[PDB]
Ligand binder design. Structure first.
Ligand code: HEM
Ligand code: HEM
Ligand SMILES: OC(Cn1cncn1)(Cn1cncn1)c1ccc(F)cc1F
Ligand SMILES: OC(Cn1cncn1)(Cn1cncn1)c1ccc(F)cc1F
Lengths: 444, 444
């Protein structure tokens, strides 16, 4: 304790200290901390590592503004090394990391988008046509949104040859094996990673199978690409004279697909679940009124400039239940957050989960109300902000919006459950409880 | 202190020797046996003393003592989310025994009568559907996996359970439970008090199975393994709960799935390697005696050579590396006494490589025999000896008889695969298992 420290939540069980409670309900646990300590800015213990939460939305900037030398991502992203590739992205020196991210940025922006809406529509219609064939049936909506999200992304981002060698299902399995390997505990207790774990070898094996497949597509392709993701990075030349290695190319592909697969899936699922719930009739009607204006074949302009209501729907689903609960950095140099200074060596967090539930910024936050707006500027941080803000944001909104436009024009849905699913907090990227996602479709 | 196995010296207290042991348990335990000039020694895994009874003349003093002296419960804690909380090792010891015995009395032995032809059918159906070409490239470890689930399901389940729970779906649930486990935790039990998404994947998989099994039982109550345990009445008046029935089904299939798969794969890999021509000929000479339809007697009393082949595969590379107990009361092992609170281990991997018991142990030689009585402990011994042993050998022998009568195989690699030690249950490195099949016959 220095006298310029956020209040600390009292710890019992030193070795843990709060990992079980936080682990069990992050929302409920961080709101008890904010309330009992009368402070938005506080410090918990996770396995003995101090974690300072910047849970006051008026203070959001002081987390998202500072450069890499003050608030550092590398150390928190160490867990992802076996996914992105060993010296890749956050694990490269910071200027090279930025080029790598920017090369990905410039493949989702924005002459590239031109063929995206119709490629998303085609995959959605093919999926509904093959899986929702009956007049009426029961589906698990989280599993099917998953299938659609991989199918649509693949079709937007890959040539037919890569898709003929790596089908969407096969891809989802590889991505899924990588994700289910990770142990979020270790972000806070990095010694856990010096332990032999079969999980990390499952995750390297998965990554290595992808690079192998990708390498075969590249040799094949170099015997007589244009718009597609792979062919872009193939042609990326760094500041210096040099080109990307296979390992890095695989890196940025993994990173883009890994990023969007679970988060957009969850978001599409949440959005539909709200929309189909009886109380939410008012909003389902508003959506049909936006979307029934449009033709069978949609375009860039339809989805982008002319669906502000669908967007509000997607944006509020992520507001109520952000899939990424916590944004984190390692405090390399002490920092003023409000009053208080966060000491060197702390993990500093800014939590979309917690900030999207501040009663000042989001009055009555458990209410899903798509016509609402943040009452504190910057409060919404679902896709981050500052130097690390999400670069799939635009792709993600357009994909989810396009699916909603296509699914609801064609089907009605009934939630088979009285209430909207609980969020299930046992997993790294957080979604609605899988158990509770049975829905009944009626073909219109 | 004076009556303690020599301790391998520890640097890095926190880990002990988890990394070395983690990376190559054979080489690491043989360096310990050689430099300390003692079969019986004590290593450190994350700070827990582990005493290895690595002298085969001393095997009995590990396997003989009853549950009050050498206790399994504490080492089986990791499997709680698989078998079911409170189930098997987690029940009091007498009830544990009834539960195991009920499982035992479902693989012994009027039950076996229909097993050989059900294994053959599934094997021929699999080859017919997957090895259809004149010749092709398969991954042998994956396909032995598919055969092992298909054959066991067809031996153990009624049509109705197989209709509702297909073999592939079963394999996924099993595989999801198994890839959750963190063997480190057997030695550092505090790791389990950590919220991990791994355990929740494992519980969810378990709970999907019970739910399906519960639907089969209600369906079935409106006029094989499942129906046995349904019929089981304990010593007292009472019957098994759904939770325990699920437990014993999960335990028997979890048990056989990865170990038999690994054994079938090893067996074939050796037999197909050019240097093992001598043995591949002997096998053909045993099996070419028999008709197209085999029976119990064919596989059981009349294939001593195939068995030697299976047994030597497990001898060179046992899938379960370490048999373990918690020392509740101090025990004499050779000279030395193993203190209360030590984990006492007996390692098939290490004892199957003692020069005395198994001269030149990295040689696969199916005609060899242990030169130290009891040395082979691939299926354990004493009160906890494997109860799928008989079923395992019959399954593998029946597959080998069926595969090799119909196909030849070429290892696509100069040498037999390395064992891959990154995984809980150990097999041949998946990478190195590409094999080329040549079909010897036609129809379908
Ligand atoms: C609703 C879906 C998504 C959500 C909620 C989301 C959320 C976020 C958040 C909160 C961050 C900040 C990470 C940090 O500050 O450490 C982020 C970063 C990132 N996202 Fe997403 N994201 C989504 C979709 C996508 C998609 C589809 C892509 C595919 C390109 C993507 C690629 C990335 C990348 C590369 C970063 C790091 C970029 C950088 O470090 O500058 N995301 N995302
Ligand atoms: C090649 C295949 C197999 C190998 C190498 C193997 C190995 C072993 C070993 C070493 C043990 C000793 C456990 C201990 O002392 O902790 C064991 C126990 C056991 N096995 Fe297997 N096993 C195999 C196949 C199977 C199969 C197919 C089943 C299916 C029912 C099965 C069911 C069991 C059960 C229930 C136990 C515990 C019984 C008790 O504690 O009394 N095993 N096995
Ligand atoms: O944030 C992730 C990594 N992550 C955090 N929790 C679990 N995985 C996911 N993500 C970000 N946007 C969408 N998904 C990510 C994946 C890729 C990446 F380049 C950065 C990055 F933070
Ligand atoms: O030993 C297993 C479970 N296990 C041990 N290490 C990793 N998983 C495997 N096993 C035993 N025979 C075949 N496989 C087991 C599974 C079921 C069981 F009842 C006991 C038991 F030890």
């Amino acid at each position: 304790t220095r006298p310029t420290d956020p209040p600390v939540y009292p710890v019992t069980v030193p070795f843990l200290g709060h990992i079980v409670q936080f682990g069990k309900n992050p929302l409920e646990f961080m709101q008890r901390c904010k309330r009992d300590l009368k402070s938005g800015v506080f410090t918990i213990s996770i396995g003995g590592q101090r974690v300072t939460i910047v849970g006051d939305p008026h203070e959001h900037s002081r987390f998202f503004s500072p450069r890499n030398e003050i608030l550092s991502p590398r150390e928190v992203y160490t867990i992802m090394t076996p996914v992105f590739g060993e010296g890749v992205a956050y694990a490269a020196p910071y200027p090279r990391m930025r080029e790598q991210l920017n090369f990905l940025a410039e493949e989702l922006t924005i002459a590239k988008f031109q063929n995206f809406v119709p490629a998303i529509q085609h995959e959605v219609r093919k999926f509904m046509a093959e899986n929702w064939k009956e007049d009426e049936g029961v589906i698990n909506l989280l599993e099917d949104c998953g299938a659609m999200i991989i199918n649509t992304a693949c079709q937007c981002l890959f040539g037919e040859d890569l898709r003929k060698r790596l089908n969407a299902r096969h891809f989802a399995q590889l991505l899924s094996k990588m994700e289910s390997s990770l142990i979020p505990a270790a972000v806070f207790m990095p010694w856990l990673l010096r332990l032999p774990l079969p999980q990390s070898a499952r995750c390297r094996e998965a990554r290595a199978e992808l690079q192998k497949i990708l390498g075969e597509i590249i040799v094949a392709r170099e015997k007589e690409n244009t718009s597609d993701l792979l062919g872009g990075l193939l042609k990326a030349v760094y500041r210096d004279g040099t080109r990307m290695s296979l390992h890095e190319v695989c890196g940025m592909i993994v990173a883009a697909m890994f990023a969007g697969q679970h988060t957009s899936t969850i978001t599409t699922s949440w959005s539909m679940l709200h929309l189909m719930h009886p109380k939410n009739k008012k909003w389902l009607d508003k959506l049909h009124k936006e979307i029934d204006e449009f033709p069978a074949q949609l375009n860039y302009d339809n989805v982008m400039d002319e669906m502000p209501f669908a967007e509000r729907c997607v944006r509020e689903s992520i507001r109520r239940d952000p899939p990424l609960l916590m944004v984190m950095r390692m405090v390399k140099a002490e920092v003023k957050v409000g009053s208080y200074v966060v000491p060197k060596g702390d993990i500093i967090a800014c939590s979309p989960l917690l900030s999207h539930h501040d009663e000042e910024a989001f009055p009555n936050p458990r209410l899903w109300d798509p016509e609402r707006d943040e009452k504190v500027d910057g409060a919404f941080i679902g896709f981050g902000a500052g130097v690390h803000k999400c670069i799939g944001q635009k792709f993600a909104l357009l994909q989810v919006k396009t699916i909603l436009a296509t699914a609801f024009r064609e089907y009605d849905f009934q939630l088979l459950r009285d209430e909207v699913p609980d969020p299930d907090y046992h997993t790294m990227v957080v979604g609605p409880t899988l158990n509770q996602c049975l829905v009944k479709y009626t073909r219109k």
